[PDB]
Design a protein around this motif. Structure first.
Motif, short mmCIF file in Angstrom:
data_model
loop_
_atom_site.label_atom_id
_atom_site.label_comp_id
_atom_site.label_asym_id
_atom_site.label_seq_id
_atom_site.Cartn_x
_atom_site.Cartn_y
_atom_site.Cartn_z
N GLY A 95 0.82 -1.19 0.00
CA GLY A 95 0.00 0.00 0.00
C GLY A 95 0.86 1.24 0.00
N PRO A 96 0.69 2.12 1.00
CA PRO A 96 1.54 3.30 1.17
C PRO A 96 2.87 2.92 1.82
CG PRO A 96 -0.59 3.51 2.30
CD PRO A 96 -0.33 2.06 2.04
N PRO A 97 3.96 3.60 1.44
CA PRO A 97 5.32 3.26 1.87
C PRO A 97 5.53 3.42 3.38
CG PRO A 97 5.32 5.37 0.73
CD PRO A 97 3.95 4.78 0.55
N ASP A 98 5.00 4.50 3.94
CA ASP A 98 5.08 4.74 5.37
C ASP A 98 4.10 3.82 6.09
OD1 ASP A 98 5.07 7.47 3.73
OD2 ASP A 98 6.53 7.72 5.35
N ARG A 99 2.95 3.63 5.47
CA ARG A 99 1.91 2.78 6.02
C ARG A 99 2.39 1.35 6.18
NH1 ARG A 99 -3.19 4.05 7.90
NH2 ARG A 99 -2.20 6.07 7.47
N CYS A 100 3.25 0.92 5.27
CA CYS A 100 3.85 -0.41 5.35
C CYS A 100 4.56 -0.59 6.69
CB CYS A 100 4.83 -0.63 4.20
SG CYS A 100 4.05 -0.67 2.56
N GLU A 101 5.27 0.44 7.13
CA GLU A 101 6.00 0.38 8.39
C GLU A 101 5.05 0.46 9.58
OE1 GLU A 101 8.77 3.81 7.37
OE2 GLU A 101 10.20 2.23 7.88
N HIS A 102 3.98 1.23 9.41
CA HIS A 102 2.94 1.34 10.43
C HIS A 102 2.33 -0.04 10.69
CE1 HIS A 102 -0.65 3.98 12.03
NE2 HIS A 102 -0.39 2.96 12.83
N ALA A 103 1.95 -0.71 9.61
CA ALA A 103 1.38 -2.04 9.71
C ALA A 103 2.45 -3.05 10.13
CB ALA A 103 0.75 -2.44 8.39
N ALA A 104 3.70 -2.76 9.74
CA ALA A 104 4.83 -3.59 10.11
C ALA A 104 4.96 -3.63 11.61
CB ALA A 104 6.12 -3.06 9.49
N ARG A 105 4.77 -2.47 12.24
CA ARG A 105 4.89 -2.39 13.68
C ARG A 105 3.75 -3.13 14.36
NH1 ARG A 105 8.67 -2.49 17.46
NH2 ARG A 105 7.36 -3.07 19.26
N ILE A 106 2.55 -3.04 13.79
CA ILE A 106 1.40 -3.76 14.34
C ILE A 106 1.72 -5.26 14.44
CG2 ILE A 106 -1.01 -4.40 13.98
CD1 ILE A 106 -1.48 -1.80 12.58
N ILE A 107 2.18 -5.82 13.34
CA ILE A 107 2.52 -7.24 13.27
C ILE A 107 3.76 -7.54 14.12
CG2 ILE A 107 3.04 -9.18 11.75
CD1 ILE A 107 1.93 -7.40 9.45
N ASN A 108 4.78 -6.70 13.98
CA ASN A 108 6.06 -6.90 14.67
C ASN A 108 5.88 -6.89 16.18
OD1 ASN A 108 8.79 -5.66 15.92
ND2 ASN A 108 9.25 -6.78 14.03
N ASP A 109 5.12 -5.91 16.66
CA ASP A 109 4.84 -5.77 18.09
C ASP A 109 4.15 -7.03 18.61
OD1 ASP A 109 4.86 -3.30 20.16
OD2 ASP A 109 3.07 -4.51 20.55
N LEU A 110 3.24 -7.56 17.81
CA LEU A 110 2.57 -8.81 18.13
C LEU A 110 3.56 -9.98 18.11
CD1 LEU A 110 0.01 -10.31 18.79
CD2 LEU A 110 -0.50 -10.44 16.34
N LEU A 111 4.49 -9.94 17.17
CA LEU A 111 5.47 -11.01 17.02
C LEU A 111 6.62 -10.87 18.01
CD1 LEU A 111 5.75 -11.27 13.13
CD2 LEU A 111 4.37 -12.64 14.70
#
Length: 71
Positions: free
Chosen positions: A51-67
């Protein structure tokens, strides 16, 4: 987007049931998360956030934080 390591032992939590949980992630983040075959590594799959380049990192953190606890 970004190719992100997601443990094959942890994807169970990320997916939840039906993928409903990961849909909720994609919903609130406004992204697309596609689990690739495996790629990159062995014991982990690649969640392809898009999707959006910054949004990728935003969603990345969502998943990463969970992981964080999971990995």
């Amino acid at each position: 987007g970004i190719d992100v390591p997601v443990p094959r032992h942890s994807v169970g939590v990320v997916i939840g049931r039906s993928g409903e949980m990961i849909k909720k992630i994609q919903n609130d983040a406004g992204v697309r998360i596609q689990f690739k075959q495996d790629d990159g590594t062995g014991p982990e799959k690649i969640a392809h956030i898009m999707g959006p380049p910054d949004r990728c990192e935003h969603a990345a953190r969502i998943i990463n934080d969970l992981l964080q606890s999971l990995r």
